[PDB]
């Protein structure tokens, strides 16, 4: 649903941990009093269907355009003309309702600042911040990495508001595996799915 | 020889790091007194 | 053209809904409701833009296999392939490469 990297700010340790992708949580809260119609399904479904119906009027006045081209063109090679023109205007209908379900169903969110891309992620799938369950953490078995990983997850459940008394169950895979040096994700990513 | 610039410090403090990461509208100002960009609790966060 | 008439007639439907919406609720917090709804509906109108501007203009020939990514890449500015003047190879100064 997302995959997102960061980096963390200034300093001179390389090694360091760093709350960087903590901005997979950015969301803007000045004026929240009340809810957006975008995080609404509903509406986003109604956009979408209106979308549709244009999109047919289109494809139709195209196909009533195409008919008087193919009135016009002469009749010999009328029957590769209209497949070839039938090809693309059904290419573009196809990419007209794609950008629309873009649009309304998957990048509903990528322009508004009131929807982090972790609150966004979940949403085009109906989840809430609430059904996060899991959190596979890195859990390398350090401290500065344990303690920034947590408090990262922390951040990110204060800010996307989630309810209280619902922590994230964290899952640490390197207890039992170990640390690899890039396989890491490869391998939290398999006990996650 | 300064076309590198190290820059010691981030545009933000520490305490105020977690709100600039949280906050996608927060922007840099200019700062009246070090005349630097960081930044700013006010712009933090903000309706305007 | 035919895109950017249909958004505009979508923003003024949304703008007289919001209307009505904004009727119905009490006016104590009327000015509030307003701002954040007329910020989310230039919000989306921008998106719609955007994206027929990227259906029509950037990616129209993504999903068209009659143009490969070169043509398309130089035709979104109206180049055409003659118009890709100078190649910088490579050039490492082996046989096979």
Redesign the interface.
């Known amino acids: 649903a997302m995959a997102a990297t960061a980096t963390d ?3 001179r340790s390389v090694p360091a941990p760093g ?2 992708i ?2 997979t ?7 929240v009093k009340y809810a957006s119609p975008n995080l609404n399904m509903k509406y986003r479904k109604r956009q979408l269907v209106t979308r549709e119906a244009q999109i047919k009027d289109w494809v139709e006045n195209e196909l009533e355009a195409l008919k008087l081209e193919a009135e016009e063109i002469p009749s010999e090679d009328q029957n590769e003309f209209l497949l070839e023109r039938t090809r693309e205007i059904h290419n573009e209908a196809e990419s007209q309702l794609r950008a629309a379900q873009q649009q309304w169903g998957n990048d509903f969110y990528k322009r508004d ?1 009131r929807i ?1 891309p972790l609150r966004g992620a979940l949403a085009t799938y109906g989840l809430t911040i609430d059904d996060l369950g899991v959190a596979s953490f890195h859990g390398t078995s350090t401290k500065a990495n344990d303690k920034n990983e947590s408090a990262t997850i922390n ?1 990110m459940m204060k ?1 996307l508001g989630r309810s209280e008394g619902n922590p994230v169950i964290g899952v640490f895979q390197k207890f039992l595996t170990g640390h690899p040096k890039g396989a890491a994700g490869a391998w939290m990513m398999n006990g996650a799915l | 020889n300064k076309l590198f610039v190290s ?4 545009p ?1 403090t520490d305490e105020l ?2 709100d600039v ?5 927060a922007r840099v100002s200019k700062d009246k007194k070090s005349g630097s960009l960081t930044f700013n609790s006010k712009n933090i ?3 305007d």
Not at chain 1, 25 to 31: D, L, V
Not at chain 2, 7 to 10: L, Q, W
């Open positions: 700010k200034i300093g709350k960087g903590l901005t949580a950015r969301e803007h809260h000045s004026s600042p982090a951040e800010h | 820059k010691e410090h981030a933000y790091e977690e990461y949280l906050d996608p509208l966060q903000s309706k």
